[PDB]
Scaffold this active site. Structure first.
Site, mmCIF file in Angstrom:
data_model
loop_
_atom_site.group_PDB
_atom_site.id
_atom_site.type_symbol
_atom_site.label_atom_id
_atom_site.label_comp_id
_atom_site.label_asym_id
_atom_site.label_seq_id
_atom_site.Cartn_x
_atom_site.Cartn_y
_atom_site.Cartn_z
ATOM 1 N N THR A 113 0.680 -1.177 0.090
ATOM 2 C CA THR A 113 -0.020 0.135 -0.086
ATOM 3 C C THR A 113 0.813 1.400 0.068
ATOM 4 O OG1 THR A 113 -1.509 1.439 1.319
ATOM 5 C CG2 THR A 113 -0.308 -0.223 2.463
ATOM 6 N N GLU A 147 0.176 3.731 1.762
ATOM 7 C CA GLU A 147 0.496 4.154 3.216
ATOM 8 C C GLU A 147 1.754 3.974 3.718
ATOM 9 O OE1 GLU A 147 -2.289 6.143 5.857
ATOM 10 O OE2 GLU A 147 -2.547 5.678 3.441
ATOM 11 N N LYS A 150 1.643 -3.206 7.863
ATOM 12 C CA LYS A 150 1.959 -3.265 6.403
ATOM 13 C C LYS A 150 3.356 -3.464 6.026
ATOM 14 C CE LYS A 150 -2.239 -4.049 4.472
ATOM 15 N NZ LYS A 150 -2.293 -5.431 3.882
ATOM 16 N N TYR A 164 -1.549 0.769 11.322
ATOM 17 C CA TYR A 164 -1.734 -0.139 9.976
ATOM 18 C C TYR A 164 -0.565 -0.013 9.123
ATOM 19 C CZ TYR A 164 -3.440 -0.611 5.339
ATOM 20 O OH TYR A 164 -3.492 -1.147 3.989
HETATM 21 N N1 LIG Z 1 -8.411 -0.054 -0.920
HETATM 22 C C1 LIG Z 1 -7.201 0.708 -0.959
HETATM 23 O O1 LIG Z 1 -7.055 1.835 -1.496
HETATM 24 C C2 LIG Z 1 -5.806 -0.015 -0.523
HETATM 25 C C3 LIG Z 1 -4.838 0.565 -0.941
HETATM 26 C C4 LIG Z 1 -3.524 -0.464 -0.661
HETATM 27 C C5 LIG Z 1 -3.808 -1.649 -0.248
HETATM 28 N N2 LIG Z 1 -4.900 -2.012 0.260
HETATM 29 C C6 LIG Z 1 -4.810 -3.277 1.019
HETATM 30 O O2 LIG Z 1 -5.504 -4.363 0.000
HETATM 31 C C7 LIG Z 1 -6.280 -5.081 0.684
HETATM 32 C C8 LIG Z 1 -7.719 -5.112 0.099
HETATM 33 O O3 LIG Z 1 -8.376 -3.552 0.663
HETATM 34 P P1 LIG Z 1 -9.934 -3.661 0.528
HETATM 35 O O4 LIG Z 1 -10.186 -2.307 0.232
HETATM 36 O O5 LIG Z 1 -10.591 -4.824 -0.392
HETATM 37 O O6 LIG Z 1 -10.246 -4.024 2.056
HETATM 38 P P2 LIG Z 1 -11.399 -4.638 2.611
HETATM 39 O O7 LIG Z 1 -12.777 -4.260 1.783
HETATM 40 O O8 LIG Z 1 -11.609 -3.809 3.922
HETATM 41 O O9 LIG Z 1 -11.145 -6.144 2.731
HETATM 42 C C9 LIG Z 1 -10.272 -6.849 3.795
HETATM 43 C C10 LIG Z 1 -10.844 -8.331 3.827
HETATM 44 O O10 LIG Z 1 -9.771 -8.867 4.646
HETATM 45 C C11 LIG Z 1 -10.820 -9.788 5.459
HETATM 46 N N3 LIG Z 1 -10.121 -10.013 6.767
HETATM 47 C C12 LIG Z 1 -9.985 -9.036 7.759
HETATM 48 N N4 LIG Z 1 -9.480 -9.448 8.782
HETATM 49 C C13 LIG Z 1 -9.307 -10.865 8.594
HETATM 50 C C14 LIG Z 1 -8.943 -12.015 9.401
HETATM 51 N N5 LIG Z 1 -8.310 -11.898 10.600
HETATM 52 N N6 LIG Z 1 -8.778 -13.158 8.640
HETATM 53 C C15 LIG Z 1 -9.309 -13.308 7.362
HETATM 54 N N7 LIG Z 1 -9.764 -12.365 6.785
HETATM 55 C C16 LIG Z 1 -9.957 -11.140 7.370
HETATM 56 C C17 LIG Z 1 -12.136 -8.900 5.489
HETATM 57 O O11 LIG Z 1 -13.414 -9.869 6.011
HETATM 58 P P3 LIG Z 1 -14.736 -9.115 6.311
HETATM 59 O O12 LIG Z 1 -15.536 -8.942 5.290
HETATM 60 O O13 LIG Z 1 -15.275 -10.404 7.344
HETATM 61 O O14 LIG Z 1 -14.270 -7.934 7.369
HETATM 62 C C18 LIG Z 1 -12.352 -8.496 3.971
HETATM 63 O O15 LIG Z 1 -12.664 -9.604 3.185
HETATM 64 C C19 LIG Z 1 -6.195 -4.836 2.097
HETATM 65 O O16 LIG Z 1 -5.055 -5.638 2.644
HETATM 66 C C20 LIG Z 1 -5.731 -3.497 2.256
HETATM 67 O O17 LIG Z 1 -4.959 -2.977 3.406
HETATM 68 C C21 LIG Z 1 -6.075 -1.148 0.079
HETATM 69 N N1 LIG Z 2 -12.190 7.649 6.778
HETATM 70 C C1 LIG Z 2 -12.135 9.147 6.819
HETATM 71 N N2 LIG Z 2 -11.484 9.785 6.313
HETATM 72 C C2 LIG Z 2 -11.216 11.249 6.285
HETATM 73 C C3 LIG Z 2 -12.443 11.839 6.898
HETATM 74 N N3 LIG Z 2 -12.173 13.126 6.783
HETATM 75 C C4 LIG Z 2 -10.959 13.349 5.950
HETATM 76 N N4 LIG Z 2 -10.499 12.136 5.937
HETATM 77 C C5 LIG Z 2 -9.173 11.723 5.336
HETATM 78 O O1 LIG Z 2 -9.083 11.202 4.045
HETATM 79 C C6 LIG Z 2 -7.916 10.527 3.938
HETATM 80 C C7 LIG Z 2 -8.270 9.200 3.435
HETATM 81 O O2 LIG Z 2 -8.479 8.432 4.300
HETATM 82 P P1 LIG Z 2 -9.268 6.802 4.137
HETATM 83 O O3 LIG Z 2 -10.493 7.222 3.066
HETATM 84 O O4 LIG Z 2 -10.003 6.529 5.545
HETATM 85 O O5 LIG Z 2 -8.336 5.855 3.508
HETATM 86 P P2 LIG Z 2 -6.939 5.888 4.042
HETATM 87 O O6 LIG Z 2 -5.867 6.456 3.029
HETATM 88 O O7 LIG Z 2 -6.409 4.294 3.891
HETATM 89 O O8 LIG Z 2 -6.612 6.423 5.264
HETATM 90 C C8 LIG Z 2 -7.236 10.442 5.178
HETATM 91 O O9 LIG Z 2 -6.093 11.522 5.246
HETATM 92 C C9 LIG Z 2 -8.232 11.068 6.267
HETATM 93 O O10 LIG Z 2 -7.552 11.809 7.310
HETATM 94 C C10 LIG Z 2 -13.575 11.004 7.456
HETATM 95 O O11 LIG Z 2 -14.484 11.583 7.895
HETATM 96 N N5 LIG Z 2 -13.445 9.588 7.399
#
Ligand SMILES: NC(=O)c1ccc[n+]([C@@H]2O[C@H](COP(=O)([O-])OP(=O)(O)OC[C@H]3O[C@@H](n4cnc5c(N)ncnc54)[C@H](OP(=O)(O)O)[C@@H]3O)[C@@H](O)[C@H]2O)c1
Ligand SMILES: Nc1nc2c(ncn2[C@@H]2O[C@H](COP(=O)(O)OP(=O)(O)O)[C@@H](O)[C@H]2O)c(=O)[nH]1
Ligand SMILES: [Cl-]
Length: 345
Positions: free
Chosen positions: A132, A134, A160, A156
């Site tokens: 990520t 992040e 990661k 987090y």
């Molecule tokens: N979305 C982004 O912008 C972003 C960017 C970079 C990296 N990532 C990473 O990419 C991955 C996918 O992202 P996403 O947005 O699809 O995340 P998400 O929607 O929050 O999905 C996380 C998944 O992991 C499962 N999970 C959580 N804790 C678990 C555990 N203890 N054992 C088994 N399964 C578990 C959740 O199950 P439940 O449905 O039961 O909660 C869900 O299926 C994550 O690792 C995230 O940190 C995300």
């Molecule tokens: N989740 C969340 N993020 C917010 C909010 N207001 C501002 N942010 C900002 O939006 C950015 C993106 O956060 P988020 O969508 O949770 O994804 P992230 O990059 O994994 O933290 C972060 O800098 C937050 O601080 C809010 O009400 N909820």
């Protein structure tokens, strides 16, 4: 036919990735957590009529904190590819449960790598880790790229970061095909409801239909490189089809503020946000036709904010042939329209 195993298959990316691999003819296994209620809404259409469609799709109970369950699953299905997408994926929540976050998002990665070794699958199974942007946190260069040093700013991101490096180490120590997708932020109508983008579009949809009065946000000035999750899962698959394992940034190469996301979302329902009050303070608020529609609540701040992320996806474009398709305009509009359609459904 190849066998893929997806952890986190019920999440945003896992649901899109599962569709992508099924269309390529994979047999797709997903690990689901036990839940006290229905928790497979994002993939329910993939198994809805499984008895007639005969889809190569199967869900299994497991958890990334249970090493023996992971090894038991992998030893039986012997996958060609594992995509570790499972995580406590929320930055803000990681400040409230840093230990669970470390155990899932850090050691869980290692458990799966060790499962591959314990099964003697080092020459069989490729491993994708959901890294990520992040990790860059307090960014050390702009834009950020594969060589940008990391500076994590949440529990987090720390967890990661452990996962990024334990993946590199197993690749280098054991000649395993294991790599890190360094994906920048990606959203969709399937994004979790408490991420800022989905929170904005659900609130704007409810405001349009008169089912909500005001949207409460934190830091309006945070800036993010924002793509569509459906574009990004293909990059994950493309990294695993390379001859040599390597880490890749995946991004749009442009960033936008939370504030601009708010403005664009309201424009999709024909509404103009005017910002009032000292800009950047908790007194700032967003006015639509005279009515306060956006407010700042410090409860949504993070103690150590990540102010700005901007990806350089040059390596992914040239080595994988990957490029984002969904523009930022299209991303916002697709989410606002999706969330309105969901309310009227
Ligand atoms: N979305 C982004 O912008 C972003 C960017 C970079 C990296 N990532 C990473 O990419 C991955 C996918 O992202 P996403 O947005 O699809 O995340 P998400 O929607 O929050 O999905 C996380 C998944 O992991 C499962 N999970 C959580 N804790 C678990 C555990 N203890 N054992 C088994 N399964 C578990 C959740 O199950 P439940 O449905 O039961 O909660 C869900 O299926 C994550 O690792 C995230 O940190 C995300
Ligand atoms: N989740 C969340 N993020 C917010 C909010 N207001 C501002 N942010 C900002 O939006 C950015 C993106 O956060 P988020 O969508 O949770 O994804 P992230 O990059 O994994 O933290 C972060 O800098 C937050 O601080 C809010 O009400 N909820
Ligand atoms: Cl099933």
């Amino acid at each position: 036919s190849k066998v893929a195993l997806i952890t986190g298959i019920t999440g945003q990316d896992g649901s899109y990735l599962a569709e992508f691999l099924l269309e390529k003819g994979y047999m797709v296994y997903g690990i689901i957590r036990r839940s006290s209620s229905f928790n497979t809404g994002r993939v329910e259409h993939l198994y809805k009529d499984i008895h007639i469609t005969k889809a190569k799709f199967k869900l299994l109970y497991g958890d990334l904190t249970d090493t023996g369950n992971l090894i038991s699953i992998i030893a039986k299905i012997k996958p060609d590819e594992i995509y570790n997408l499972a995580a406590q994926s929320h930055v803000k929540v990681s400040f409230e449960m840093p230990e669970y976050t470390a155990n899932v998002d850090g050691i869980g990665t290692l458990r799966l790598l060790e499962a591959i070794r314990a099964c003697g699958l080092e020459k069989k199974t490729k491993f994708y880790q959901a890294s990520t942007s992040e990790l860059y946190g307090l960014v050390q260069e702009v834009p950020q790229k594969e060589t940008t040093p990391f500076y994590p700013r949440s529990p987090y991101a720390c967890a990661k970061l452990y996962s990024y490096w334990i993946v590199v180490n197993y690749r280098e120590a054991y000649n395993m095909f294991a790599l890190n997708g360094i994906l920048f932020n990606h959203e969709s109508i399937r994004r979790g409801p408490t991420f800022v983008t989905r929170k904005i579009t659900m609130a704007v949809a409810r405001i349009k239909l008169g089912l909500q009065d005001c949207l409460y946000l934190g830091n309006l000035d945070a800036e993010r490189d924002w793509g569509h999750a459906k574009d990004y899962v293909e990059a994950m698959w493309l990294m695993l089809q390379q001859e040599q394992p390597r880490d890749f940034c995946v991004a749009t190469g442009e960033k936008h503020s939370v504030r601009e996301f708010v403005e664009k979302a309201f424009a999709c329902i024909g509404q103009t946000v005017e910002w009032k009050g000292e800009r950047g303070t908790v007194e700032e608020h967003g006015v639509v036709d005279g009515v306060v529609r956006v407010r700042v609540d410090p409860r949504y701040f993070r103690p150590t904010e990540v102010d700005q992320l901007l990806g350089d996806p040059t390596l992914a474009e040239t080595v994988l042939g990957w490029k984002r398709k969904v523009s930022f305009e299209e991303l916002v509009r697709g989410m606002v329209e999706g969330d309105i359609e969901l309310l009227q459904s």
